[PDB]
């Protein structure tokens, strides 16, 4: 059986750590809701 | 049980201990994660139950006690924050850039920032803290890295 618990508000916060980069990516989804590279 | 807004960490003791397989949204009294977090099943919060309403495999999405609530979009330009989870850690925001999943039926927002599975379901955020999507089914890309689909749910 599985459980839920509190972890937070939903809130913007400033100055948080800015990182990850930003792809264009060519990509598909299939019937079972997997993303895939397209090349 | 717990119906307070906010984010939610999702829970099992079917295997070692007690583990993370994901994380979810409550807004106005309806839980919301990404199916493959679930699978479609009931989950506890204290001693009351959350019954599924709405899902669907290929959005991979899933709503409990009521209809998909969240409906804002990414603007395709400004930043958002993933609110992650990641199990046994803080909630910690991360602010990043998305880039673009382009599909047959149109372009996606994605978020690459690498984080344990038991991450999926994170909600990703507007600069007036409104849920956009959740964080959690994307690809795996040549780096080995994992780039999330900002994946929002239709509000009727
Ligand atoms: C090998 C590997 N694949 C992905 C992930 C991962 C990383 C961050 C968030 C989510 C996931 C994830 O598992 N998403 C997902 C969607 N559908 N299913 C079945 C599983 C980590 N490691
Ligand atoms: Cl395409």
Known sequence: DMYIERAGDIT??????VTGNSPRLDVALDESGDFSLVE | ?????????????????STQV??????????????????????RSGEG????????????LVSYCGPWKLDAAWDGLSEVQLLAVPPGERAKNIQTLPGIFKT?????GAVAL???AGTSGSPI????????????????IKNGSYVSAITQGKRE
């Open chain 1, 12 to 17: 913007w916060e400033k100055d948080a750590e």
């Open chain 2, 49 to 60: 139950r959350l019954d599924p309403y709405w899902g669907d495999v290929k959005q991979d």
């Open chain 2, 1 to 17: 049980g717990e119906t307070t807004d906010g984010v939610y960490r999702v829970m099992t003791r079917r295997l070692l201990g």
């Open chain 2, 125 to 140: 955020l507007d600069k007036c803290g409104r849920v956009i999507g959740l964080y959690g089914n994307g690809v795996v």
């Open chain 2, 114 to 116: 690498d984080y344990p």
């Open chain 2, 22 to 43: 994901g994380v979810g949204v409550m807004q106005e009294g309806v839980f919301h994660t990404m199916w493959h977090v679930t699978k479609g099943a009931a989950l």
């Open chain 2, 104 to 108: 047959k039926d149109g372009d996606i």
